[PDB]
Amino acid sequence: MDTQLLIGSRFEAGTEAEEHILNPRTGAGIIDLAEASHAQIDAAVDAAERAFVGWSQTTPAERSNALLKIADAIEKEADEFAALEALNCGKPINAVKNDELPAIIDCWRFFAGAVRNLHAPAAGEYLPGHTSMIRRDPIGIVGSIAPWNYPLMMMAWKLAPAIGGGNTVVFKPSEQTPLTALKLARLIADILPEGVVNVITGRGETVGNALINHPKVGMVSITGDIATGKKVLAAAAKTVKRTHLELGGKAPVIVYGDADLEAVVNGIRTFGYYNAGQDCTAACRIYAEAGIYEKLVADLTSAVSTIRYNLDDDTENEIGPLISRRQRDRVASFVERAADQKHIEITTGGRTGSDEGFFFQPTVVAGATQEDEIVRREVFGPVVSVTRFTGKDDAVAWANDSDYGLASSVWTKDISKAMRAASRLQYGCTWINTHFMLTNEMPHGGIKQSGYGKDMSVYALEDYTAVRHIMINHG
Amino acid sequence: MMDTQLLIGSRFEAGTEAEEHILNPRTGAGIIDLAEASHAQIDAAVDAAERAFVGWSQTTPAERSNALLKIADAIEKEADEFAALEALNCGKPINAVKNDELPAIIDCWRFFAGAVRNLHAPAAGEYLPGHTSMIRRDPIGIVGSIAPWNYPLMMMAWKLAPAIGGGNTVVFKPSEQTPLTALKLARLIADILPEGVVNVITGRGETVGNALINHPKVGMVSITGDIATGKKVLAAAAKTVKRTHLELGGKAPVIVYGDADLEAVVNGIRTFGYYNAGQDCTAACRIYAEAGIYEKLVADLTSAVSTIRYNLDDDTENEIGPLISRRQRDRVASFVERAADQKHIEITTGGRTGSDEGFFFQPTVVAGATQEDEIVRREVFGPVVSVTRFTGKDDAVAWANDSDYGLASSVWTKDISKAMRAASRLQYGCTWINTHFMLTNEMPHGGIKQSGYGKDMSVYALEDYTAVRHIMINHG
Amino acid sequence: MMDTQLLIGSRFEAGTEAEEHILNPRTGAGIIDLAEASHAQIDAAVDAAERAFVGWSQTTPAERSNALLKIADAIEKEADEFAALEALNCGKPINAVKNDELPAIIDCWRFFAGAVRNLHAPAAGEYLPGHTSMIRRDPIGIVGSIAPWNYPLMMMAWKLAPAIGGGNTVVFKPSEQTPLTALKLARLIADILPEGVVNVITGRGETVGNALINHPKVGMVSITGDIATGKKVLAAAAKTVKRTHLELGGKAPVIVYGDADLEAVVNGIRTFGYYNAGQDCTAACRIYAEAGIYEKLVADLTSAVSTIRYNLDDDTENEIGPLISRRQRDRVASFVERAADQKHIEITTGGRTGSDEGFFFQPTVVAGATQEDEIVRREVFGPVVSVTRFTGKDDAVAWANDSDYGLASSVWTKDISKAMRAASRLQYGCTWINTHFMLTNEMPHGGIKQSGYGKDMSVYALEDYTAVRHIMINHG
Amino acid sequence: MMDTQLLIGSRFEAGTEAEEHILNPRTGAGIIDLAEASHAQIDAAVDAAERAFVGWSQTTPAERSNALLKIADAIEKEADEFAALEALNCGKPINAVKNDELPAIIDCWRFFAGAVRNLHAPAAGEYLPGHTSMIRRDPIGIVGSIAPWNYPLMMMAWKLAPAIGGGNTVVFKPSEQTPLTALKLARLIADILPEGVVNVITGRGETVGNALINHPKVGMVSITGDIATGKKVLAAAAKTVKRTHLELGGKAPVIVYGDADLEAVVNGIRTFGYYNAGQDCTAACRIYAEAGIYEKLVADLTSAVSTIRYNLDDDTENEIGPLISRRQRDRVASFVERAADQKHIEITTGGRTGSDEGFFFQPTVVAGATQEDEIVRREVFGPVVSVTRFTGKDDAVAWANDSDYGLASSVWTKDISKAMRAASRLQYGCTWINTHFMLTNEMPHGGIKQSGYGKDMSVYALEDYTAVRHIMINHG
């Protein structure tokens, strides 16, 4: 098992308080990993600093080939990466083998292409006798923090564009899911020059905080919850660091009277619950039109109750557990408060789903209002709420009356309603007659309280570069 | 007699709070007293912005483009009067405003009208089988924008045109000392845009500015000012995850190699070190000069700087105006004094006040300055240029990059090789070769590090004000 | 009385050669006899374009942009008069020209004024170590430009603005039947652009057009016409390897599925199959109709198409005009007669000429035409629409794609799925869904296959008239 | 033995028709006799392409991109033997192929994998109220591609990658003398792509090329060759309005100013005037030298060019190889002999045949040549460079621009000012400064004027192989 922090030339174990990496299926310990010391953080940033000298001066072709190699490396060990990510997070193995790894590998490969393909306004004489041109240069040293929900994927989202942009990076995985990142570190170490990627581990309160507050770091990119985005943003206020923030969502799913209701029910069954709802695009806040509302609640209830989790044979599991006990408790807590509200019904699930480990019952919350906490607040759990709306009600406006703005979907056979919703929804993403489907060419990222900056697509790479104007006078 | 009222929705309204004394900074005389926005007027402006967003955000690129074309026309129709108003308010020499500023302002509005209809994105298509994807660029929401005082009207163009053109609505505040051209423009805009798309409030940063940037309904804040104010805006936005667009000043390095056309360098710095009395983010103010040429450069610049004319009765004959206020002069003076206190440093010309009335400081050259010197390390924002020597075992590029700032820069050399190497390595939003200062509305302006991020002018300013959206349609 | 003279550099001139009889197409009466440009005059136009290129190719995007804005402004000042002159010349109903064409023309000039300033390319930078590359889009040369008779003034815009905008100079020829607005515009342009940048000559394809296409100083030829002229231009270009820009006709397929809003479909075709008397490269003319609704659609279409007003004294009451010439009407009539010859084909309304005076044809519905029929295979360019049935066995899209044409199409259904799938697979420069005919200046119009290639409107038009260049500078 | 079979759809198939005598151009001895494709096999290859297009045009960028990456892997796995095969077939010095060509070929497949997923267009949105437009870049159809013999394997990469990348299907013909690497690569590709996406046929331009370019199903023709072949390809396409993609040679001007670095100029011209025996479309062949340095340059170049090594047994030691064929060697010799008969021209070195055996021509310097001379005006495509004196009353840029060709060019000067002015005014697809010849896969290659249009390498080649489509959806 790979246990060591990558710092410049060398691998070394932690020096600080150990963290208890648990297997969330059963609650048992996998390994104990010591956090990086402040000194260890300092040397990582330093190795990133001295590596930026050479790395920022590389050609796009040089950087692109590096990324292709990284992709080849992950591809070779795809099965091992999967199993190790299935252990760390208790994700069903086949969902990881089939869904995550190939997207991950495809991502490294997308960015190999994107690197050699940036555009800008054309070079020429905008002023007489002066030739202007636009470049995109590196920014500096990037401090990157990933969450626990898709460890290895998040790493790809954070590393590839920043490295591709000619930056150097100090990366910290979530305190509970450092495993795939340390295995990756090893392969990366063989491919990149020393210090272009450095990987430290530890708790956010201590290791995260020191990284985002380190004076040498010019950009900080985080994916997590709002609380932490605010901390990052407050820390940036000190030295005017660039920020890249993806802070979660509460994806509205507008279901009109004329939707293919069978496909809707199947869409929410998969995409409301995948990764036990620990996905920031989860199909979780549903708006059902008056006519189909009762039909939907029942049909979905029936569908959700059949979702398989925690079986002995992992190939038969559709859903894994929540990452930790604190996280399950947080989910249990949200639901309990909702079930307390007299106008709400819990039609299936609603309780803890596990003797050991951190499973929760796939849950359906019916009859929730725009005013309910369950509708206003990210639950990040296998939980879906349903809200009814009238013909007299603007379901798009209801959907836009939110703090979140990451992703959304609309279901209808109708063209007029599909297109009008798609033009008016205030969301980074809007799917029509599906949900959740990502592709590495297309940008992921929100507005409002979901934050700013993209992941995937050429825009991710534009976020990690600086536009520069060069103007030569013809004397 | 003059444009004095705030623009709040469909209401023109005098502020109801504390008055500001807007001074003719040539004479120190009071031009006018302007009551600032009350808290409730701040609220009404944001509320008009919110109401206007509904319609305005659903306009087409052609409608917004045509609106922007009209503002330019309106400005153009009143170029004489805008220029005369800004000259009075800021003390800028009238012909400088007429020939340099107004044509660039009008061009800006016109540029963005074109940019509005010309946004690109990855092509639409099936990236996943049976799913058509396409990318849009939609409005973000309500912008609070704050302008500084060095170019009141041009800053407004930069702040407004790309925000409006993105289909955003705006609450705009000019700086406390220079609200006049903004109030004037607000009158003309009211007759062109639907009400509530653009709203204009006046007041102090600590009061009106602070309420504007902390308003829950404001989704993005854009400011051009100093580093302290940026750190303020970032601290506010931390409370609600507001998007930010920050231009925080610079200390433009000017690398002069030995094989430089030394005359051209002198003439450049004479203009671009001192234009607008050095009250310009991109001022040619931190000169690095190779050992071979240092001494000659120091003397020729010294002599050239000393002939810069100002505070003449015939405004035609003035090349720069005064600093904006007493406090700014006093601050510039102190930088000069502290630097002159240094044994290795020589003030070769100027370095003293340039008028009894008003706020002129003398064009100053500070020679013998070292990389450790405050005068090299920190932004002066007055008519002051420092010269540092570099030797052959020194890396002028490294030296220039060793800075908290990253907005603009120039390199001077007859040698295409050294130029291109310099240009490629400089950690500066912009690098001129064998000139300085020259702007064109198609080209982005904006810095790195503590200079901030985001661009003004170019298509990029407009990309900073729109949200990228992925739409995916499942066929089957 | 009327603008009569050719623009040849700094000079307005009567044409030296034989005269065209410019006819009023709704009465058949003569409007004016106009002398063609002689060969020496074609030489002088092109020489003046060569001299103008020296300067013009070297102007800034901003300069060219300001110039296109001023032309937009000029056409706008005289909009009514342009409309009336176009109406008279072309038989178009006065209010269609006034409300549809003029605003679109003006906006085309304004659109390109922006596009001129917003070209992108790959970013500059070091793709090879020590080498700084950049991409420019430079002018191509002298453009020989030829317009068809369908929309004289709009085609001018589509041809002049991107070409001039790209920094090319131009020698433009309207169609022999419709030079009138082109010459009125020529005077206006002459007061804005440096002499020789735009040149306007008049005359026939086989004489003046030929002499222009073949001139060894012309580096690019842009034509909008029929497949026949396109082949002629292509062959002419072959001998000198000229760049070509060709829009050569379309036979727009209209797929109507069982779940279409038939009311909308019928009103769409009533308007778009017949606008400008069907003298439109994009006319809704080849309908494919699912068996379930085929019957109703034919009957409902017949009824609406029979109410179409034309040839009335109240020109505000007219919906469509006449064909351009007797030649064109007779060509249309021969198409309709041959279609009427087939046993399986039924003409439900119209089918004969529609005036005693002038060149009107009766709006025509042709029912039961199949895939191998001439009325489906070939462009009629008359107020004539065929309807063809497909069953569930049939792949309506495969049918549509089985064509030499590739310009425009539409698909009508309330089902999002079927609509997107059609849009993905249609082999046509443009596909409208649940509408037709709608153009917008930011969006490109242009065919594949035998409709030619290259674009009008959008930045792609402007890309067509520029040469991409790679500059690479060695640092070492 | 080797790979000799043609690739038609699923089947590998021997050529049935007249044999081509494939020679080793170093010795003039036969390598293999290869029978050409019959009319039937040509027809079968086009038909396979037609079938394969139904699926392949419907694939995602991701799957096409993956396919390109795999083709790259396969070439890389067999880098050395492709190197050996090309060195033998073409006479290229082994190390040059191994180190220059193979790297660039592999990189070329990998760059297009990228490009395939990174196409941009104008952003989707509502440009007309209530209508959502988006732009797609869709495949064109079946591509007929013809490569020359100067870089068999590289040309194939340029022809296939953007073609297949854009989702088109291909019938491809290598040059008659040089099919060996294409037939090898053909077997690797059949293991990677779906059946019929790529088809390889062999034979002469006059038979096989002619039939390929005339086939009614081929929608686009791409050729790199001489101007003569471009003209007739154009004539063919004229009949049927096929898209063309023409790269038709160069005569690259090399402007050497007085303040140039003459060691670097001489070293540049030594390599790039003569690399691949001057059989390169970008060869630095047409030199313009300023009066002040004209005599030193001629002398220094002459002596640099006389030390060029070729025709040695130790191939590692050879710097250039022979011409492809006896016809080519003789074509160059007559170019040189006709230059020699000019009394004003001086042949400073070579000018004669360069081997008993094989098709070597001696590296040649032609001094004293004029703007009026054949040797200046026409592409020689041999190891031959011409030098032409210019004065201060002469505009070297204007002189360079007075040519039928427009592919590539360089300028040599240490002066910033002269380089940028030359780069901005030169009428060439490409301008290097203080280097020549260097290519990079992100950066477009392709000419203007009689060099033809359309690009190789870069996202532009991929644009050339796709159709821009406007899709507009009505919300009503």
Radius of gyration of chain B (CA): 23
Beta strands in C189-337 (DSSP E): 198-200, 220-224, 243-247, 252-256, 284-290
Query: Is D17 tagged catalytic?
Result: no
The CA angle D274-D278-D284, to the nearest 5 degrees, is 70
- Nearest Cα residue to D168 out of D116, D100, D109: D116
Q: D176 to chain B, minimum CA–CA distance in Å?
A: 39
Of B248, B434, B474, the CB nearest to A434: B474
Distance CA C116, CA D411 (A): 28
Cα(first)–Cα(last) distance of chain D, in Å? 67
Distance CA B55, CA A341 (A): 37
Q: Are A284 and A271 in contact (CB under 8 A)?
A: no
Amino acid identity, residue B398? A
Segment 297-356 of chain D within 8 Å of chain B by CB: none
Contact criterion met (CB < 8 Å) for D110 and A68: yes
Distance CA C92, CA C152 (A): 11
Q: Does C124 touch chain B (CB under 8 A)?
A: no
CA dist list (Å): D93 to D2, D26, D100, D276 = 21, 10, 11, 9
How many CB pairs below 8 A link C and D?
Answer: 163
Contact criterion met (CB < 8 Å) for C241 and D219: no
Breaks (C-N over 2.5 A) in chain A follow: none
C459, C472, C475: best to mutate for the D interface, most D CBs within 10 A: C472
Q: Residue C116 half-sphere exposure, CB side, CA atoms within 13 Å?
A: 33
C141 three-state secondary structure: coil
Q: Does B1 touch chain D (CB under 8 A)?
A: no
- Nearby residues of D99 by Cβ (< 8 Å), 6 or more positions away: none
- Nearby residues of C159 by Cβ (< 8 Å), 6 or more positions away: C145, C146, C147, C170, C172, C222, C224, C456
Which chain A residues have a beta carbon less than 8 Å from that of D114?
Answer: 64, 112-117
Q: Are B426 and B395 in contact (CB under 8 A)?
A: no
Phi, psi dihedrals of residue A266, rounded to the nearest 5°: -65, -30
Q: A68 to chain B, minimum CA–CA distance in Å?
A: 20
**Maximum distance among all alpha carbons in chain B?**
80
- Nearest Cα residue to D119 out of D470, D443, D468: D468
Which 8-state DSSP code applies to residue D30? E
Distance CA C366, CA C286 (A): 10
- Nearby residues of A152 by Cβ (< 8 Å), 6 or more positions away: A81, A85, A100, A104, A180, A181, A184
Distance CA C434, CA C255 (A): 10
Q: Are C416 and C408 in contact (CB under 8 A)?
A: no
- Nearest Cα residue to B416 out of A40, C365, D432, C143: D432
The label of the residue with tokens 């006059």 reads D206
Q: Are C402 and C428 in contact (CB under 8 A)?
A: no
Q: B62 to chain D, minimum CA–CA distance in Å?
A: 7
Q: Does B130 touch chain D (CB under 8 A)?
A: no
Distance CA A92, CA A89 (A): 9
Contact criterion met (CB < 8 Å) for A441 and D117: yes
Q: C222 to chain A, minimum CA–CA distance in Å?
A: 24
The label of the residue with tokens 């009061």 reads B207
The label of the residue with tokens 């309106």 reads B74
Distance CA B180, CA B2 (A): 9
Q: Does D69 touch chain A (CB under 8 A)?
A: yes
- Nearest Cα residue to B162 out of B203, B78, B222: B222
How many CB atoms are located within 10 Å of the residue D63 CB? 11
Q: Are B58 and B125 in contact (CB under 8 A)?
A: no
Question: Helix A179-191 crosses helix A78-89 at what angle (to 10 degrees)?
Answer: 150
The secondary element (H helix, E strand) that includes residue D72 is helix D61-77
The label of the residue with tokens 């360098």 reads B265
Contact criterion met (CB < 8 Å) for B61 and D413: no
Query: Alpha helices of D91-226 — where are they, by DSSP H?
Result: 94-96, 102-116, 152-165, 180-190, 210-214
Distance CA B21, CA A395 (A): 50
Contact criterion met (CB < 8 Å) for C440 and B62: yes
Distance CA D164, CA D405 (A): 29
Cα(first)–Cα(last) distance of chain C, in Å? 67
- Nearest Cα residue to C63 out of C165, C198, C196, C141: C165
Q: D81 to chain B, minimum CA–CA distance in Å?
A: 36
Q: C327 to chain D, minimum CA–CA distance in Å?
A: 25
Distance CA A73, CA A93 (A): 20
Distance CA D25, CA D149 (A): 12
3-class SS letters over C296-324: HHHHHHHHHHCCCCCCCCCCCCCCCCCCC
Report how far Cα D139 is from the mean position of its chain's Cα atoms. 23
Q: Does C453 touch chain D (CB under 8 A)?
A: yes
C117, C411, C433, C457: best to mutate for the B interface, most B CBs within 10 A: C117
| Closest CA in chain B for residue A471 | B432
Radius of gyration of chain C (CA): 23
Distance CA B215, CA B46 (A): 8
Q: Does C59 touch chain B (CB under 8 A)?
A: no
Q: Going edge to edge, which strands form the sheet with B131-139?
A: A345-348, A363-366, A383-389, A283-289, A251-255, A407-411, A429-432, B466-474, B131-139, B125-128
Phi, psi dihedrals of residue D33, rounded to the nearest 5°: -100, 120
The secondary element (H helix, E strand) that includes residue B411 is strand B409-412
Question: Helix A151-164 crosses helix A179-191 at what angle (to 10 degrees)?
Answer: 30
Query: Alpha helices of C374-415 — where are they, by DSSP H?
Result: 374-377, 396-401
Distance CA D16, CA C392 (A): 45
Beta strand C11-13 with C19-23 is unpaired
Q: Residue D358 half-sphere exposure, CB side, CA atoms within 13 Å?
A: 22
Report how far Cα C84 is from the mean position of its chain's Cα atoms. 20
CA dist list (Å): B442 to A125, C60, C65, C354 = 11, 11, 12, 55
Residue C134 pairs in a beta bridge with C471
Q: B465 to chain D, minimum CA–CA distance in Å?
A: 15
The CA angle B386-B388-B391, to the nearest 5 degrees, is 165
The label of the residue with tokens 């399986």 reads C344
Q: Does A261 touch chain D (CB under 8 A)?
A: no
Tokens of A296: 């939907």
Of D127, D425, D433, the CB nearest to C440: D127
Distance CA D301, CA D363 (A): 11
Beta strand B243-247 with B253-256 is unpaired
Q: Does D229 touch chain C (CB under 8 A)?
A: no
Q: Does B471 touch chain C (CB under 8 A)?
A: no
Contact criterion met (CB < 8 Å) for A119 and C124: no
> What resolution does the deposited structure have, in angstroms?
2.3
Phi, psi dihedrals of residue A361, rounded to the nearest 5°: -70, 125
| Closest CA in chain D for residue B62 | D127
Tokens of D280: 């390169």
Distance CA C239, CA C242 (A): 8
Contact criterion met (CB < 8 Å) for A123 and C135: yes
B442, B443, B460: best to mutate for the C interface, most C CBs within 10 A: B442
B399 is an annotated ligand-binding site residue: no
Distance CA D258, CA D261 (A): 9
| Closest CA in chain D for residue B412 | D416
Q: Is D18 exposed, middle or buried (0-12, 13-18, 19+ CB in 10 A)?
A: middle
How long a stretch of residues is chain B? 476
- Nearest Cα residue to C213 out of C303, C146, C288, C125: C146
D38 three-state secondary structure: coil
Domains with residue ranges and CATH for chain B: 3-249+441-476 (3.40.605.10), 250-440 (3.40.309.10)
The label of the residue with tokens 């109030």 reads B183
Contact criterion met (CB < 8 Å) for C440 and D476: no
- Nearest Cα residue to B183 out of B145, B152, B150, B224: B152
Residue D153 pairs in a beta bridge with none
3-class SS letters over chain A: CCCCEEECCEEECCCCCEEEEECCCCCCEEEEEECCCHHHHHHHHHHHHHHHHHHCCCCHHHHHHHHHHHHHHHHHCHHHHHHHHHHHHCCCHHHHHHHHHHHHHHHHHHHHHHHCCCEEECEEEEECCEEEEEEEECCCEEEEECCCCCHHHHHHHHHHHHHHCCCEEEEECCCCCCHHHHHHHHHHHHHCCCCCEEECCCCHHHHHHHHHCCCCCCEEEEECCHHHHHHHHHHHHHHCCEEEEECCCCEEEEECCCCCHHHHHHHHHHHCCHHHHCCCCCEEEEEEEHHHHHHHHHHHHHHHCCCCECCCCCCCCCECCCCCHHHHHHHHHHHHHHHHCCCCEEEECCCECCCCCCCECCEEEECCCCCCHHHHCCCCCCEEEEEEECCCCCHHHHHHCCCCCCEEEEECCEHHHHHHHHHHCCCCEEEECCCCCCCCCCCECCCHHHEECCECCHHHHHHCCEEEEEEEECC
Contact criterion met (CB < 8 Å) for B133 and A236: no
Residue B28 pairs in a beta bridge with none
Contact criterion met (CB < 8 Å) for D234 and C231: no
| Closest CA in chain C for residue D459 | C122
How many CB pairs below 8 A link A and C?
Answer: 77
CA dist list (Å): B125 to B473, D122, D252, D475 = 10, 13, 40, 20
**Binding-site residue set of D for NAD(+):** 147, 149-150, 173, 176, 206, 226, 229, 281, 331
Q: Does B60 touch chain D (CB under 8 A)?
A: yes
Distance CA D346, CA D342 (A): 8
Q: Is D307 exposed, middle or buried (0-12, 13-18, 19+ CB in 10 A)?
A: exposed
Distance CA A303, CA A286 (A): 15
D17 three-state secondary structure: coil
- Nearby residues of A419 by Cβ (< 8 Å), 6 or more positions away: D132, D473, D475
The label of the residue with tokens 């369908």 reads C150
Distance CA A5, CA D336 (A): 68
Q: Are D156 and D147 in contact (CB under 8 A)?
A: yes
